[PDB]
Amino acid sequence: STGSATTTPIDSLDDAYITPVQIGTPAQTLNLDFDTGSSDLWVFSSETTASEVDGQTIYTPSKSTTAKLLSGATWSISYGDGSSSSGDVYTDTVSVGGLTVTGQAVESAKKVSSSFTEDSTIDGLLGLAFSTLNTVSPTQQKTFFDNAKASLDSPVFTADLGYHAPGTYNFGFIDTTAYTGSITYTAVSTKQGFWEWTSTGYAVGSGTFKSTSIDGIADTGTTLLYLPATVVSAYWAQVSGAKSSSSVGGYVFPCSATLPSFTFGVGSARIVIPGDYIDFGPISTGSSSCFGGIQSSAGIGINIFGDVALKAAFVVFNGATTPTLGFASK
């Protein structure tokens, strides 16, 4: 089997991407944030505290003939940005782009933090990291991908995120028309539960490539590119007037600037992030200070190849017995 679904930016900045997902019988379609940095499929639901729902579409398990309470199971998750959610668990039929999993754990939110409430466009998350990170207790549950894997034509999914445009998540096949040149594959460590890999270095603009190992995760659920302070300082030093602002919470730059590109290494290959991808616009409406899309990972504890980086590539998440990651230009 295979599946193919379009993923759409939630706003003009590509802050996140939503992908329609069919849950239950008859289908209830919710728009979920596919997140290769976590491993829970959770949704706004008929059980979510009413004051914490503001415009989201909810899953109502009582209206699904295939929903079953997973008795005794609870979940609770905290994300890197400080947001969180928790609740109980149902199993139900879940389909993405024509690919159907029966008996999928659908984590029903009883509580969500304010950032989720305030984002009316995201009806939940669909985790695509390794199932060892799944938070369901006392019986850990498998991700949608883990459940689908054996049925897939090939045990892979791909992320093809758009810049200010829709893109695609495919399951079970590699669309050889969706990228240019060849795909370069690189080793993955699953020790922390993430799609963790080591970039071979970077360049700023037309500058020379610096060969240096940068361990980080491929995370579709993180907006920006978070790299070591040395790398980030080297980038922003090429933008006149750019500075790190503790009050704003990162590097800012004059909105009048033209940003240089940023290149990262995948083995001997190179992925170029155009300068425009690094512009996250005014810090507040009407400001001439703009927020940067490359930020320091210092104090996160991990480097994160978020959407800013991934949307410059066609990315293969290879879930073979020994997982790997592939990157191509597009």
From Swiss-Prot:
Disulfide bonds join 255-290. GO terms for biological process: proteolysis. Residues 17-328 form the Peptidase A1 domain. It catalyses: Hydrolysis of proteins with specificity similar to that of pepsin A, prefers hydrophobic residues at P1 and P1', but does not cleave 14-Ala-|-Leu-15 in the B chain of insulin or Z-Glu-Tyr. Clots milk. Keywords: Aspartyl protease, Disulfide bond, Hydrolase, Protease, Signal, Zymogen. It comes from the Eukaryota. The active site is at 35, 199. One of its GO terms (molecular function) is aspartic-type endopeptidase activity. Its EC number is 3.4.23.22. Belongs to the peptidase A1 family. This is Endothiapepsin. It comes from Cryphonectria parasitica (Chestnut blight fungus). The chain holds residues 90 to 419 of 419 of the full protein.
